[PDB]
Amino acid sequence: SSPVAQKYDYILVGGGTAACVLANRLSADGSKRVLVLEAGPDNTSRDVKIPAAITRLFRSPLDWNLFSELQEQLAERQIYMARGRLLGGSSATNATLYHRGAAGDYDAWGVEGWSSEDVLSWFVQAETNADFGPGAYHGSGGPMRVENPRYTNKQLHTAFFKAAEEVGLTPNSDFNDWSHDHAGYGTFQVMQDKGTRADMYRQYLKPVLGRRNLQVLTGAAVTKVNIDQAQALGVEFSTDGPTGERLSAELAPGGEVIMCAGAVHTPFLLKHSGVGPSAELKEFGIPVVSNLAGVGQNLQDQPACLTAAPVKEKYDGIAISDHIYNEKGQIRKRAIASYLLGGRGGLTSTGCDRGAFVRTAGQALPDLQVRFVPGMALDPDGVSTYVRFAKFQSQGLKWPSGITMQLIACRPQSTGSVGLKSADPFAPPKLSPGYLTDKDGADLATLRKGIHWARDVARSSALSEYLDGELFPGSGVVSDDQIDEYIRRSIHSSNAITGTCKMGNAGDSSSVVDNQLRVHGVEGLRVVDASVVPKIPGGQTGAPVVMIAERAAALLTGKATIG
Ligand SMILES: Cc1cc2nc3c(=O)[nH]c(=O)nc-3n(C[C@H](O)[C@H](O)[C@H](O)COP(=O)(O)OP(=O)(O)OC[C@H]3O[C@@H](n4cnc5c(N)ncnc54)[C@H](O)[C@@H]3O)c2cc1C
């Protein structure tokens, strides 16, 4: 009742990060009728816009609330895996850190037309940096906002860097400068506009909601993609939910369909629609249009564990928790004043924006990413701690002062999978991250060795002046075997998730999409979101999604070509 006798040149399933990019570029003339279907509501929540309020988006209505299958290798725990549910997708619910990985992350992709040189310019193109001048590696005219964090903990941040210097690390002035090595300590830039989240709804879609050739439907939950037998012909969706009507959106001649549902829901929705492993499709009685075995495999996510240590009594009150909450748990009016009048202060911080990339065992590229947080976790699951920090408000307790080093396997060797658990196209998918399953035990070894690394840093002279013991894992956990068991019961997602519909060369039978993102054996079908990522880069995966999205967009409209 919303696409009524209307045929669209590009239907977009999903209204997230990449989808917000293409809608902008493809609606940019007037000849194309763009449609954008999004399960979740408009982007209007104040919790989206204030960075420190990220503590309220986890496990919230704006999250899909995905939980994984039992992971036997993880002491049989389900893993909560954050996924944004609103226009702007996970860009509106992320920690905003800006990371391209290294040039070798893209060279190693293998694919033709996506080397480090081919992608570099698409990055710069979409960037406007507040803190680096325009050059080979940074843009100034782009739609993304990028800035050095406008919050600084004058004691804990400076003691962290002195400490990482003590244990032998070198600084790194720009983790997205490919001319020098990617390892080292320093400061993560964040996709924020003067302390407001600079999500992709705000930077790309909100400035273009005027275009009459641009139709954006929130509340609109896609169920499948029409593929008359191969050619896609549209989508089916429901505006109310699993108890609503079964509408249909038709495409115009040549009208393509663009999978933007993200690394979790795209491979899922493709399967329900007929493209995937037949063995899995036959189990629920779904006709096979294409039998590509790569749909729903190769799921890569970066696992994390943490250490936590309180500060000495004498330095009580100097953590970021002390800057946001008072001793009674109420939000400080001073912090609100610095944020609303100046775009400064504790509320501009997602917390984890200082850190490092470290080689643990002479690897080609760093295997460990440390994230330092001048706040003290109260649960070894760092995601659950943020949820807890939210509910702590107004209870009347003082959150203890301290620090946290979150440790992350930024280039993991484990892979996962995304599958079908029901025929109900509104059911939670079969999600298995598969952390710690690589055949050499390397991911676990990277995380164990980060624990030793984190303890060295915390033992340094720079940090031992401020610290008083160790809460997590703590004094009991001494031997490697004990560290591993702690890692297993505390491993949490650092929220990347890539690869479930990977691109590859012609004759890559394991590949799903080709180097122009159209999928093997379907007409008018393309995938442009994090799923196409063939190897996860070394860093948080937001920025490369945009780069993919800006790239496909141009290619679609004949402004550049690949190969
Ligand atoms: C909590 C969190 C923290 C993160 N931190 C960082 C970080 O600091 N820096 C960074 O660079 N990256 C970070 N990431 C990752 C980054 O946000 C993602 O990699 C990126 O946003 C993925 O973009 P996408 O377009 O592939 O998917 P999304 O942005 O998720 O877009 C997919 C969209 O599809 C929609 N959808 C799903 N099913 C349907 C359906 N049936 N019908 C219609 N729409 C549907 C979803 O609602 C969603 O809006 C973080 C991720 C999370 C969750």
Side-chain angles (χ1 to χ4, degrees), residues 42-68:
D42 191 37
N43 192 327
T44 56
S45 163
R46 187 185 299 114
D47 294 321
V48 179
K49 308 179 145 79
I50 306 186
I54 191 185
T55 62
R56 311 164 163 175
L57 301 173
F58 282 113
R59 295 277 279 150
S60 97
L62 303 165
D63 197 281
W64 281 91
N65 292 85
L66 303 192
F67 276 80
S68 80

mmCIF file of all heavy atoms in Angstrom, residues 42-68:
data_model
loop_
_atom_site.group_PDB
_atom_site.id
_atom_site.type_symbol
_atom_site.label_atom_id
_atom_site.label_comp_id
_atom_site.label_asym_id
_atom_site.label_seq_id
_atom_site.Cartn_x
_atom_site.Cartn_y
_atom_site.Cartn_z
ATOM 1 N N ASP A 42 12.693 5.360 12.343
ATOM 2 C CA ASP A 42 13.533 6.466 11.908
ATOM 3 C C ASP A 42 14.693 6.636 12.884
ATOM 4 O O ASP A 42 14.685 6.106 13.997
ATOM 5 C CB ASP A 42 12.714 7.761 11.818
ATOM 6 C CG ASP A 42 13.463 8.914 11.099
ATOM 7 O OD1 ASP A 42 14.203 8.666 10.116
ATOM 8 O OD2 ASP A 42 13.283 10.084 11.504
ATOM 9 N N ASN A 43 15.714 7.371 12.455
ATOM 10 C CA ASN A 43 16.813 7.713 13.356
ATOM 11 C C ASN A 43 16.449 9.028 14.033
ATOM 12 O O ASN A 43 16.668 10.098 13.471
ATOM 13 C CB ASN A 43 18.141 7.796 12.603
ATOM 14 C CG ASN A 43 19.354 7.850 13.544
ATOM 15 O OD1 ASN A 43 19.278 8.409 14.633
ATOM 16 N ND2 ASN A 43 20.470 7.264 13.115
ATOM 17 N N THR A 44 15.878 8.964 15.247
ATOM 18 C CA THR A 44 15.634 10.207 15.975
ATOM 19 C C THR A 44 15.950 10.147 17.469
ATOM 20 O O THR A 44 15.552 11.066 18.195
ATOM 21 C CB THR A 44 14.178 10.693 15.820
ATOM 22 O OG1 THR A 44 13.260 9.681 16.242
ATOM 23 C CG2 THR A 44 13.874 11.083 14.394
ATOM 24 N N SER A 45 16.655 9.132 17.966
ATOM 25 C CA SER A 45 16.808 8.988 19.414
ATOM 26 C C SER A 45 17.998 9.786 19.921
ATOM 27 O O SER A 45 19.085 9.728 19.339
ATOM 28 C CB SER A 45 16.982 7.525 19.817
ATOM 29 O OG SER A 45 17.508 7.445 21.144
ATOM 30 N N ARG A 46 17.812 10.487 21.042
ATOM 31 C CA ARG A 46 18.937 11.216 21.614
ATOM 32 C C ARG A 46 20.064 10.278 22.054
ATOM 33 O O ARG A 46 21.200 10.729 22.231
ATOM 34 C CB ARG A 46 18.461 12.078 22.781
ATOM 35 C CG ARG A 46 19.501 13.004 23.337
ATOM 36 C CD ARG A 46 19.018 13.766 24.582
ATOM 37 N NE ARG A 46 17.857 14.629 24.345
ATOM 38 C CZ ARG A 46 16.651 14.435 24.885
ATOM 39 N NH1 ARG A 46 16.438 13.405 25.704
ATOM 40 N NH2 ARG A 46 15.657 15.274 24.610
ATOM 41 N N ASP A 47 19.773 8.988 22.237
ATOM 42 C CA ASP A 47 20.788 8.024 22.631
ATOM 43 C C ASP A 47 21.693 7.680 21.474
ATOM 44 O O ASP A 47 22.840 7.263 21.691
ATOM 45 C CB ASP A 47 20.135 6.744 23.126
ATOM 46 C CG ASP A 47 19.383 6.947 24.357
ATOM 47 O OD1 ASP A 47 19.873 7.714 25.216
ATOM 48 O OD2 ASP A 47 18.302 6.353 24.463
ATOM 49 N N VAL A 48 21.172 7.818 20.252
ATOM 50 C CA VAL A 48 21.995 7.669 19.061
ATOM 51 C C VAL A 48 22.997 8.813 18.950
ATOM 52 O O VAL A 48 24.155 8.600 18.567
ATOM 53 C CB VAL A 48 21.096 7.566 17.818
ATOM 54 C CG1 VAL A 48 21.930 7.439 16.606
ATOM 55 C CG2 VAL A 48 20.169 6.360 17.947
ATOM 56 N N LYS A 49 22.588 10.031 19.316
ATOM 57 C CA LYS A 49 23.379 11.211 18.971
ATOM 58 C C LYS A 49 24.457 11.522 19.990
ATOM 59 O O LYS A 49 25.495 12.090 19.633
ATOM 60 C CB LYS A 49 22.476 12.438 18.814
ATOM 61 C CG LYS A 49 21.286 12.248 17.868
ATOM 62 C CD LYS A 49 20.472 13.534 17.833
ATOM 63 C CE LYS A 49 19.869 13.803 16.449
ATOM 64 N NZ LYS A 49 18.639 12.993 16.203
ATOM 65 N N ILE A 50 24.247 11.162 21.245
ATOM 66 C CA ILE A 50 25.228 11.392 22.298
ATOM 67 C C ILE A 50 26.132 10.162 22.358
ATOM 68 O O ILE A 50 25.623 9.051 22.601
ATOM 69 C CB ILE A 50 24.542 11.665 23.643
ATOM 70 C CG1 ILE A 50 23.546 12.824 23.455
ATOM 71 C CG2 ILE A 50 25.561 11.987 24.729
ATOM 72 C CD1 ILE A 50 22.897 13.326 24.689
ATOM 73 N N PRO A 51 27.448 10.305 22.118
ATOM 74 C CA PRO A 51 28.325 9.112 22.082
ATOM 75 C C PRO A 51 28.287 8.294 23.368
ATOM 76 O O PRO A 51 28.122 7.069 23.301
ATOM 77 C CB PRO A 51 29.726 9.699 21.823
ATOM 78 C CG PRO A 51 29.490 11.062 21.276
ATOM 79 C CD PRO A 51 28.181 11.550 21.837
ATOM 80 N N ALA A 52 28.453 8.927 24.536
ATOM 81 C CA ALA A 52 28.456 8.161 25.790
ATOM 82 C C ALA A 52 27.159 7.399 26.039
ATOM 83 O O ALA A 52 27.170 6.433 26.812
ATOM 84 C CB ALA A 52 28.711 9.058 27.005
ATOM 85 N N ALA A 53 26.045 7.824 25.430
ATOM 86 C CA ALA A 53 24.777 7.103 25.529
ATOM 87 C C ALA A 53 24.786 5.792 24.779
ATOM 88 O O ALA A 53 23.786 5.080 24.805
ATOM 89 C CB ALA A 53 23.609 7.958 25.012
ATOM 90 N N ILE A 54 25.876 5.430 24.107
ATOM 91 C CA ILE A 54 25.966 4.094 23.522
ATOM 92 C C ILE A 54 25.699 3.012 24.553
ATOM 93 O O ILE A 54 25.300 1.902 24.190
ATOM 94 C CB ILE A 54 27.342 3.889 22.879
ATOM 95 C CG1 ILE A 54 27.353 2.618 22.026
ATOM 96 C CG2 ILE A 54 28.427 3.859 23.963
ATOM 97 C CD1 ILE A 54 28.735 2.289 21.465
ATOM 98 N N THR A 55 25.861 3.335 25.840
ATOM 99 C CA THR A 55 25.602 2.388 26.910
ATOM 100 C C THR A 55 24.124 2.001 27.004
ATOM 101 O O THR A 55 23.805 0.972 27.610
ATOM 102 C CB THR A 55 26.121 2.969 28.244
ATOM 103 O OG1 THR A 55 25.446 4.180 28.587
ATOM 104 C CG2 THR A 55 27.571 3.292 28.127
ATOM 105 N N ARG A 56 23.225 2.787 26.414
ATOM 106 C CA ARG A 56 21.800 2.489 26.411
ATOM 107 C C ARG A 56 21.310 1.875 25.108
ATOM 108 O O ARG A 56 20.164 1.438 25.048
ATOM 109 C CB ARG A 56 20.974 3.747 26.697
ATOM 110 C CG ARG A 56 21.406 4.557 27.903
ATOM 111 C CD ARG A 56 20.786 5.928 27.841
ATOM 112 N NE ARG A 56 20.809 6.646 29.117
ATOM 113 C CZ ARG A 56 20.399 7.911 29.272
ATOM 114 N NH1 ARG A 56 19.940 8.601 28.220
ATOM 115 N NH2 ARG A 56 20.453 8.490 30.471
ATOM 116 N N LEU A 57 22.123 1.822 24.059
ATOM 117 C CA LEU A 57 21.641 1.196 22.832
ATOM 118 C C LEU A 57 21.833 -0.318 22.816
ATOM 119 O O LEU A 57 21.039 -1.026 22.183
ATOM 120 C CB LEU A 57 22.323 1.834 21.623
ATOM 121 C CG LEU A 57 22.065 3.346 21.536
ATOM 122 C CD1 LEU A 57 22.906 3.970 20.424
ATOM 123 C CD2 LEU A 57 20.576 3.556 21.291
ATOM 124 N N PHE A 58 22.862 -0.842 23.485
ATOM 125 C CA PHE A 58 22.990 -2.293 23.642
ATOM 126 C C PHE A 58 21.739 -2.893 24.254
ATOM 127 O O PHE A 58 21.208 -2.369 25.237
ATOM 128 C CB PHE A 58 24.174 -2.624 24.538
ATOM 129 C CG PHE A 58 25.462 -2.524 23.848
ATOM 130 C CD1 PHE A 58 26.369 -1.552 24.199
ATOM 131 C CD2 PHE A 58 25.772 -3.404 22.842
ATOM 132 C CE1 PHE A 58 27.572 -1.473 23.552
ATOM 133 C CE2 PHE A 58 26.956 -3.332 22.193
ATOM 134 C CZ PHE A 58 27.865 -2.344 22.541
ATOM 135 N N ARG A 59 21.283 -4.003 23.675
ATOM 136 C CA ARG A 59 20.187 -4.786 24.224
ATOM 137 C C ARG A 59 18.914 -3.985 24.322
ATOM 138 O O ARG A 59 18.027 -4.331 25.103
ATOM 139 C CB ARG A 59 20.546 -5.344 25.604
ATOM 140 C CG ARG A 59 21.674 -6.344 25.577
ATOM 141 C CD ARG A 59 21.135 -7.706 25.220
ATOM 142 N NE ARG A 59 20.554 -8.353 26.393
ATOM 143 C CZ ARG A 59 19.547 -9.219 26.357
ATOM 144 N NH1 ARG A 59 18.983 -9.538 25.197
ATOM 145 N NH2 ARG A 59 19.097 -9.758 27.485
ATOM 146 N N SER A 60 18.831 -2.911 23.567
ATOM 147 C CA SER A 60 17.739 -1.954 23.592
ATOM 148 C C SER A 60 16.770 -2.237 22.458
ATOM 149 O O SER A 60 17.013 -3.115 21.625
ATOM 150 C CB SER A 60 18.293 -0.539 23.466
ATOM 151 O OG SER A 60 18.215 -0.131 22.105
ATOM 152 N N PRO A 61 15.642 -1.504 22.382
ATOM 153 C CA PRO A 61 14.741 -1.681 21.220
ATOM 154 C C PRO A 61 15.418 -1.452 19.876
ATOM 155 O O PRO A 61 15.031 -2.066 18.869
ATOM 156 C CB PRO A 61 13.638 -0.640 21.462
ATOM 157 C CG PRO A 61 13.664 -0.370 22.932
ATOM 158 C CD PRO A 61 15.081 -0.566 23.381
ATOM 159 N N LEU A 62 16.430 -0.585 19.828
ATOM 160 C CA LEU A 62 17.108 -0.285 18.578
ATOM 161 C C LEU A 62 18.144 -1.336 18.213
ATOM 162 O O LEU A 62 18.852 -1.164 17.217
ATOM 163 C CB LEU A 62 17.749 1.106 18.650
ATOM 164 C CG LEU A 62 16.762 2.243 18.980
ATOM 165 C CD1 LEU A 62 17.480 3.517 19.386
ATOM 166 C CD2 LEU A 62 15.725 2.528 17.850
ATOM 167 N N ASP A 63 18.243 -2.414 18.982
ATOM 168 C CA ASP A 63 19.137 -3.518 18.677
ATOM 169 C C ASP A 63 18.308 -4.725 18.282
ATOM 170 O O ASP A 63 17.206 -4.926 18.800
ATOM 171 C CB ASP A 63 20.057 -3.870 19.861
ATOM 172 C CG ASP A 63 21.254 -4.725 19.432
ATOM 173 O OD1 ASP A 63 21.086 -5.950 19.243
ATOM 174 O OD2 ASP A 63 22.381 -4.178 19.283
ATOM 175 N N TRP A 64 18.824 -5.493 17.328
ATOM 176 C CA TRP A 64 18.158 -6.722 16.926
ATOM 177 C C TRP A 64 18.083 -7.735 18.058
ATOM 178 O O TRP A 64 17.249 -8.647 18.001
ATOM 179 C CB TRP A 64 18.877 -7.332 15.733
ATOM 180 C CG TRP A 64 18.551 -6.687 14.447
ATOM 181 C CD1 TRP A 64 19.206 -5.644 13.859
ATOM 182 C CD2 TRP A 64 17.480 -7.039 13.572
ATOM 183 N NE1 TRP A 64 18.600 -5.318 12.660
ATOM 184 C CE2 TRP A 64 17.540 -6.164 12.460
ATOM 185 C CE3 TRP A 64 16.474 -8.005 13.616
ATOM 186 C CZ2 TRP A 64 16.628 -6.233 11.405
ATOM 187 C CZ3 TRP A 64 15.578 -8.076 12.574
ATOM 188 C CH2 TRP A 64 15.660 -7.194 11.478
ATOM 189 N N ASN A 65 18.926 -7.595 19.087
ATOM 190 C CA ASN A 65 18.970 -8.545 20.198
ATOM 191 C C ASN A 65 19.267 -9.954 19.700
ATOM 192 O O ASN A 65 18.716 -10.938 20.192
ATOM 193 C CB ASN A 65 17.678 -8.520 21.005
ATOM 194 C CG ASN A 65 17.498 -7.239 21.736
ATOM 195 O OD1 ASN A 65 16.999 -6.264 21.178
ATOM 196 N ND2 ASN A 65 17.920 -7.212 23.000
ATOM 197 N N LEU A 66 20.147 -10.056 18.714
ATOM 198 C CA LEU A 66 20.605 -11.370 18.300
ATOM 199 C C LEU A 66 21.388 -12.021 19.433
ATOM 200 O O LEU A 66 22.116 -11.348 20.171
ATOM 201 C CB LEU A 66 21.455 -11.259 17.033
ATOM 202 C CG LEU A 66 20.694 -10.578 15.885
ATOM 203 C CD1 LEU A 66 21.414 -10.734 14.564
ATOM 204 C CD2 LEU A 66 19.278 -11.124 15.785
ATOM 205 N N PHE A 67 21.174 -13.323 19.612
ATOM 206 C CA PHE A 67 22.029 -14.167 20.431
ATOM 207 C C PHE A 67 22.480 -15.327 19.571
ATOM 208 O O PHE A 67 21.752 -15.771 18.678
ATOM 209 C CB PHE A 67 21.323 -14.697 21.674
ATOM 210 C CG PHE A 67 21.328 -13.747 22.832
ATOM 211 C CD1 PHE A 67 20.431 -12.694 22.888
ATOM 212 C CD2 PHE A 67 22.217 -13.918 23.870
ATOM 213 C CE1 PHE A 67 20.426 -11.835 23.940
ATOM 214 C CE2 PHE A 67 22.211 -13.057 24.945
ATOM 215 C CZ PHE A 67 21.309 -12.006 24.976
ATOM 216 N N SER A 68 23.698 -15.793 19.814
ATOM 217 C CA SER A 68 24.241 -16.878 19.014
ATOM 218 C C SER A 68 23.784 -18.207 19.583
ATOM 219 O O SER A 68 23.336 -18.295 20.727
ATOM 220 C CB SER A 68 25.771 -16.834 18.979
ATOM 221 O OG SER A 68 26.339 -17.389 20.156
#
